[PDB]
Design a protein around this ligand. Structure first.
Ligand SMILES: Nc1ncnc2c1ncn2[C@@H]1O[C@H](COP(=O)(O)OP(=O)(O)O)[C@@H](O)[C@H]1O
Ligand SMILES: Nc1ncnc2c1ncn2[C@@H]1O[C@H](COP(=O)(O)OP(=O)(O)O)[C@@H](O)[C@H]1O
Ligand SMILES: [Zn+2]
Lengths: 569, 557
């Protein structure tokens, strides 16, 4: 897999080469140490036991050289593991801010969470706990086959021909094991799809006083499915048994060949026994690769997730009121269209309202204006300058926004407000508190704006969260302002804060609002009704109301709902 | 594990047989490494080819025997477990039909899928894979150890020098990082939460930026530096910890311990041969015990969770349309009341609403009236009978409810509204939908009322909520319970939902969780709750004249 070589920094190319060369040295040294058993054990079992000392001397010198080069490889492995951990994490942290928000799907977000968080202990020890064993046990059988080739070319051929056979055996065992486990998990999941359906709706069934028929139905389905589920099991039989049989029939075949040559006279008894021992050392590395299959699989999954983070589509790159322009803009998650033929050119200093049902892309429009994403089609410009083609400083300092969620970062209230402009003076903070109605919360808080408002610090309700979110956008000196809110009647300070914010903000800048309620989008100079991602109406509030279009019917229905109450008509 | 052991009670006898069959297979798969020693003995003795062929047939026969036993035991264990899985899936089905209805709205606990699907797969792998693996991984090293001890106790005991060194190094690396080891899982979870916040809070960093990006990167760098400072000093320990177990070191120490004995004539050269065959990979064997036993805990946790689900309390039955409440006290956690001494009575046919600050037991009280739970003290008497004495057939015929999170049911719209009375005709369902202001949309569907509903469909949240309201029409009760948030959860369908919920409310002892203070202007009764206790009781005008909590709250909005 080429990903692991991509993760390593350019600094440590002097450690990658010095790791690969020393790993090859350790592999060749292990192969020589295994092959040195031939004269050693030949002298051991023969009628000259003392002759084996010299080959024991060579073996122990070989072992100490292996100790030194293995220490070097493991030290460089740990050091390169820390280096690649730092490189991977910092590249992820430098990538994701530049990753377009389209990439952050729920599954992609989950994989990014795992990559940032769960891949800590792994990358600190991938190259030392996986690559060193794997590479040192994958190249040792072939290395011993090569080494025996210098003792007898037919013997080396006999050893090396089995390496391909046994690697094919390992591949077959892995396939037939993991596929069997996949099938087992699939069957277990499919059987339990009934119980999920029952459990989710069992309150609705109880309200319908029909729980017993549903339970009987699901039990009958379970019994019927299990009746066929307890027959015809074949797949897992050649699983681990397949490799456990391959790595024993190979041993018996090679030992039988050795003794066949012994009776044939080409070899002596000591040579036959020593060759049996070496042809057992030939087989032991295949066990280690089998034991590394789960760790290798998990590391392969984590490296795939890290490559997903490191391959997300990044956004390319290239103080009065600006003009924000839209030209045939479209956006879609998959094939589901969110925006369809949207075009506008809002003049500087204007105030506009983007309204419509939740199926439209109002927040999509605001995020595209703010430069959170590259639009799927069309062009979004700042006075003719495409948002993606700005310097990062200009792009970040171009637009101020109030999100649907509050997105409080668990800091203090002053910290929660000052992210709009940390360089601003306390007077601007006071103006933000006055307009956003958070001063009512300052009346409650002990320390005021310095009080911690974290999740464990203060249990702020939705109204306080949205008011401080409004203050965030108010504080920033961005030449463009946007607002999308989910204000309700739960806390009436929310709409008052919004009304004061979008009106009393003294700075000159383009403003946009997205909201559902009535009697507050009056202050917007223009209106852009959107249906299913396409603009259907345009004009002022009163203009559209007089026109008697979709906006008028929406106004009438929401007015009827607002005046409604419980207890009578 | 007590709960896990109790769950696995009916599998003890088969699993004991598995733990013997696999212990046998493990020995049979190590048998040829004994017959190779025998073969070396014969070749030293120079036996004729007939005895050689006899031993070669013995070895291949044992290999076939051990390859057939594993297949047979796998086949048998995959049908031992496959019927216990059916028994468990059929037992959880009965348990799910007897839990309190608030159990499925639990918080701080595993999801239903994580409780019934994943915890059954991790039990299937506890029985069929992990117990065979974990008995094999203990039989193999211990059988190898005892065989090598039989061969020669001298070179056998020398195998423990690297094992002792490895254990000493692991212990020394553990004691010097006890605080760090304790902190590491906690820091991992904390950084997982921080990464989640950095990801869901991405737009603020993207637009506002500044302190947020630097703060997240600072926390990530602090975690990285914590890991590096933790494990960098132990590289000296952790490298020499790996060489000691490597097969090359085992081979070298085997030969250094044996070759002097062979040359000095203190042990026959064939007694050394078993160590060469088997004792080289002995280090990598004991390192497999830990991974083997690690596969039992992962499934024992799942068994514990499913048994915990099976041990939950059940919806017990003990022993004029007027809902009553007397000394109602309810505790979520042990000794943590949220409702405290609530006494209330609702006259028949009166639309009643209760208000208060968010998070004051209002929805909990409404659910308790609906019997999603049972009060610790007091009693809710509907028509003079305590709710605890009525069955699910009787109580839920007297007290219907449409709370939040409306649930669709399998089948078409005709058999989704008529769950209470499936014998009802299509015309009754159609007029119920007309009353529920949902007949207009259902007719626009391509299949009309034959459109199949279930886990998901083309209907929005408000539309399925209206379908559940229409179902509540057919489930006629003198009493009802509701949540006002459903009245405006869908802004597009808010008006139709309001008309539908009002039409359902007509001439019924309806209780509502009221949040918008202006919606109770002409209700039949109003009540206020504070920290689980009553503060204000009266109608709209009476509480307006009171000037208390309700007046202050409404003057704020
Ligand atoms: N496939 C999707 N995954 C996640 N979010 C989506 C998807 N499709 C649409 N959205 C959300 O819908 C919004 C656009 O719709 P909008 O009209 O703003 O809805 P709302 O009225 O609820 O704000 C976007 O901000 C986006 O977050
Ligand atoms: N498991 C629990 N589920 C819900 N609320 C709980 C639980 N345990 C304790 N509580 C307390 O009970 C109160 C119930 O709040 P509630 O009025 O139901 O909120 P909502 O009106 O949003 O449903 C909460 O404020 C909470 O502090
Ligand atoms: Zn299986």
């Amino acid at each position: 897999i080429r990903t692991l070589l991509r993760l390593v920094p350019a600094e440590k190319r002097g450690a990658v080469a010095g790791y690969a060369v020393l790993t090859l040295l350790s592999v060749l040294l292990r192969a020589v140490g295994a092959v040195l058993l031939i004269p050693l054990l030949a002298a051991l079992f023969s009628d000259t036991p003392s002759d084996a000392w010299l080959w024991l001397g060579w073996l122990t010198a070989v072992t100490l050289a292996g100790w030194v080069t293995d220490t070097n490889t493991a030290r460089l492995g740990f050091d390169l593991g820390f280096a690649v951990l730092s490189r991977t994490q910092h590249d992820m942290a430098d990538r994701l801010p530049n990753v377009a928000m389209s990439w952050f799907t729920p599954d992609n977000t989950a994989t990014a969470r795992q990559a940032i968080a769960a891949t800590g202990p792994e990358l600190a020890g991938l190259v030392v706990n996986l690559l060193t064993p794997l590479i040192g046990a994958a190249l040792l059988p072939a290395a011993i086959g090569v080494a025996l080739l210098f003792v007898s070319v037919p013997l080396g051929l006999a050893a090396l021909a089995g390496v391909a056979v046994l690697f094919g055996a390992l591949a077959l065992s892995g396939r037939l094991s993991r596929a069997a486990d996949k099938v087992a998990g699939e069957t277990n999941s499919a059987f339990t799809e009934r119980i999920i359906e029952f459990a989710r709706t069992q309150q609705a069934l109880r309200a319908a006083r029909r729980v017993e028929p549903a339970r009987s139905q699901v039990g009958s389905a379970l019994a019927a499915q299990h009746g066929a589920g307890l027959r015809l099991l074949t797949m897992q039989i050649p699983g681990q048994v397949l490799f456990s049989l391959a790595g024993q029939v190979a041993l018996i075949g090679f030992a039988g060949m050795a003794v066949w040559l012994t009776v044939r006279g080409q070899l002596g008894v000591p040579e036959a026994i020593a060759l049996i021992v070496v042809l057992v050392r030939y087989l032991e590395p295949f066990a280690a690769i089998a034991d590394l299959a789960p760790a290798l699989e998990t590391t392969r999954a984590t490296l795939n997730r890290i490559q997903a983070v490191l391959d997300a589509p990044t956004l390319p790159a290239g103080g009065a009121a600006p003009s924000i322009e839209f030209d045939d803009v479209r956006f879609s998650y998959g094939d589901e269209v969110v925006l369809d033929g949207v075009s506008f050119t809002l003049r500087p200093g204007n105030t506009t309202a983007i309204v419509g049902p939740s199926g439209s892309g109002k927040t999509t429009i605001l995020s595209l204006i703010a430069g959170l994403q590259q639009p799927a089609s069309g062009r979004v410009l700042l006075d003719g300058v495409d948002v993606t083609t700005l310097d990062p400083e200009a792009r970040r300092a171009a637009v101020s926004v109030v999100f649907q969620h509050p997105y409080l970062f668990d800091g203090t209230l002053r910290d929660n407000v000052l992210v709009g402009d940390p360089e601003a003076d306390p007077d601007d903070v006071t103006a933000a508190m006055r307009l956003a109605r958070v001063d009512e919360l300052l009346d409650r808080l002990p320390d005021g704006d310095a009080t911690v408002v974290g999740e464990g610090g203060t249990a702020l309700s939705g109204g306080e969260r949205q008011r401080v979110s409004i203050a965030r956008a108010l504080l920033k000196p961005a030449p463009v302002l946007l607002v999308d809110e989910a204000t309700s009647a739960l806390d009436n300070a929310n709409e008052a804060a919004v009304v004061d914010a979008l009106t009393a903000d003294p700075r000159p800048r383009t403003r946009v609002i997205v909201a559902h309620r009535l009697a507050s989008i009056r202050h917007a100079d223009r209106v852009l009704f959107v249906e299913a991602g396409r603009v259907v109406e345009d004009g002022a509030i009163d203009e559209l109301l007089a026109a008697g279009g979709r906006f008028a019917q929406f106004w009438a229905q929401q007015q009827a709902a607002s005046e409604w109450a419980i207890g009578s008509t | 594990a007590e709960a896990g052991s109790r769950l696995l009670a009916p599998l003890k006898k088969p699993l004991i047989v598995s733990g013997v069959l696999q212990a046998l297979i493990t020995l049979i798969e190590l048998a040829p490494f004994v017959l190779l020693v025998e073969l070396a003995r014969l070749l030293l003795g120079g036996a004729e080819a007939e005895r050689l062929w006899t031993l070669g047939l013995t070895a291949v026969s044992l290999i076939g025997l051990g390859a057939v036993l594993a297949a047979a035991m796998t086949l048998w264990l995959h049908r031992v477990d496959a019927r216990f899985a059916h028994e468990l899936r059929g037992r959880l089905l009965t348990k799910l039909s007897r839990l309190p209805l608030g159990w499925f709205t639990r918080r701080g606990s595993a999801s239903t899928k994580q409780l019934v699907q994943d915890d059954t797969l991790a039990l299937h792998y506890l029985i069929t894979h992990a117990i065979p693996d974990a008995v094999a991984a203990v039989v193999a090293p211990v059988a190898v150890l005892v065989y090598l001890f039989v061969a020669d106790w001298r070179v056998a005991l020398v195998l423990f020098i690297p094992v002792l060194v490895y254990l000493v190094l692991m212990s020394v690396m553990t004691i010097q990082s006890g605080s760090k080891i304790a902190q590491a899982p906690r820091w991992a979870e904390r950084m997982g939460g921080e990464a989640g916040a950095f990801l869901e809070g991405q737009p603020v960093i993207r637009i506002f930026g500044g302190a947020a990006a630097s703060r997240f990167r600072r926390r990530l760098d602090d975690y990285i530096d914590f890991l590096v400072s933790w494990q960098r000093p132990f590289v000296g320990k952790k490298t020499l910890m790996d060489l000691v177990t490597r097969p090359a070191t085992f081979l070298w120490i085997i030969l250094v311990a044996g070759v002097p004995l062979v040359v000095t004539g203190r042990m026959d050269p064939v007694n050394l041969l078993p160590f060469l065959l088997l004792g080289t990979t002995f280090g990598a064997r004991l390192l497999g015990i830990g991974y083997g036993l690690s596969g039992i805990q992962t499934g024992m946790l799942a068994a514990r969770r499913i048994q915990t689900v099976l041990d939950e309390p059940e919806l017990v039955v003990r022993d004029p349309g007027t809902v009553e409440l007397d000394r109602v006290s309810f505790e979520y956690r042990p000794g943590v009341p949220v409702i405290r001494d609530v006494t209330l009575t609702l006259r028949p046919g009166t639309v009643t609403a209760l208000v208060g600050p968010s998070g004051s037991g209002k929805s909990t009280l409404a659910a308790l009236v609906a019997r999603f739970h049972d009060v610790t003290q007091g009693a809710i008497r509907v028509d003079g009978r305590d709710i605890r004495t009525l069955t699910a057939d009787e109580l839920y015929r007297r007290v219907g409810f449409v709370l939040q999170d409306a649930q669709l049911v399998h089948g078409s719209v005709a058999e989704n509204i008529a769950l209470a009375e499936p014998d009802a005709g299509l015309e009754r369902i159609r007029t119920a939908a007309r009353d529920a202001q949902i007949h207009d949309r259902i007719t626009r569907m391509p299949d009309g009322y034959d459109s199949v509903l279930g886990a998901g469909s083309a209907l929005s949240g408000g539309e399925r909520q209206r379908v559940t309201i229409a179902r509540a029409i057919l489930a006629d009760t003198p009493v009802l319970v509701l949540d006002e948030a459903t009245a405006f959860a869908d802004p597009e369908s808010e008006y139709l939902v309001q008309q539908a919920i009002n039409r359902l409310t007509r001439d019924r002892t309806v209780l509502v969780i009221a949040h918008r203070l202006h919606t109770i202007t002409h209700a039949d009764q109003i009540v206020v709750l504070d920290d689980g206790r009553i503060v204000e009781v009266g109608t709209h005008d009476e509480l307006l004249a009171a000037g208390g909590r309700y007046r202050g709250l409404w003057d704020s909005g």
